[PDB]
Design a protein around this ligand. Structure first.
Ligand SMILES: [Zn+2]
Ligand SMILES: [Zn+2]
Lengths: 149, 151
């Protein structure tokens, strides 16, 4: 359910199946590591990753069915997303690429930003979230194999 | 809608446990999403290092007290944690599990598990003392099952 990854051997940015949990009725939940930054070489600011969370919640769903949710990782170098379905790194990679283009081009208010809809509405940074999305697309994504410790 | 309730964040009372949405799988299992709220929305936020440490600790302690955990992640607003669980909604049972995991967290005086350049993507950004104090603050205030008030 959670592969033991060697963080010194991956090459960001990438999409990686991080684990798979089988449900009691026989379905599968695939977990993905959506890595923007190389582990231990810098982190996304908290405001920017919060904004990425709000933007990717809707844009990943526009390009991929079965999304449970997209969340920030505590290490702030990427996002975690669980999907209901069999593993499909290629398809998730294409959906992530399309959602990042949407994110980089998002030039309207951030969705769900108010004291009513967000637990820290003052901590957002649209420009930095858009630049991180452009940065990933500029470097280029790939499907990263899990290298175990 | 049902996968992610449209909560009016001004009406909740932290700290609390709240079912935040439910998504079903094709064959029929439910993925219950929970809002594990430490701080009152918009009244402060957990430091990034401390929430990162809470993620590493609660990943194992929630699993010690609750079956079917998909994962425990920090919310982007940093006022709490998000957790998806395979099973029908059970706010009371999740509340009891979370309380037990917070007691484990408050009493964690051993290395944070998985903290190294090999095992974590930002190994220097951790704060065990602050994570422990956040956990003790929640237990001191007292948890409850928060109802979802919609906008
Ligand atoms: Zn928010
Ligand atoms: Zn970590």
């Amino acid at each position: 359910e959670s592969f033991d990854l060697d963080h010194t051997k991956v090459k960001a940015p990438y999409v990686r199946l991080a684990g798979v949990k089988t449900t009691p009725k026989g379905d599968q939940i695939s977990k993905y590591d959506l890595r923007f930054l190389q582990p231990n070489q810098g982190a996304i600011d908290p405001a920017a990753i919060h904004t990425l969370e709000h933007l990717l919640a809707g844009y990943m769903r526009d390009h991929l069915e079965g999304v449970v949710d997209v969340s920030p990782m505590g290490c702030r170098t990427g996002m975690y997303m669980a999907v209901i379905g069999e593993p499909d790194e290629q398809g998730v990679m294409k959906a992530f690429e399309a959602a990042l283009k949407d994110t980089a081009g998002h030039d309207q208010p951030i969705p769900g930003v108010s004291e009513l809809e967000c637990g820290n509405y003052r901590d957002h940074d649209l420009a930095a979230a858009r630049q991180h999305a452009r940065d990933v697309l500029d470097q280029g994504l790939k499907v990263q194999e899990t290298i175990l410790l």
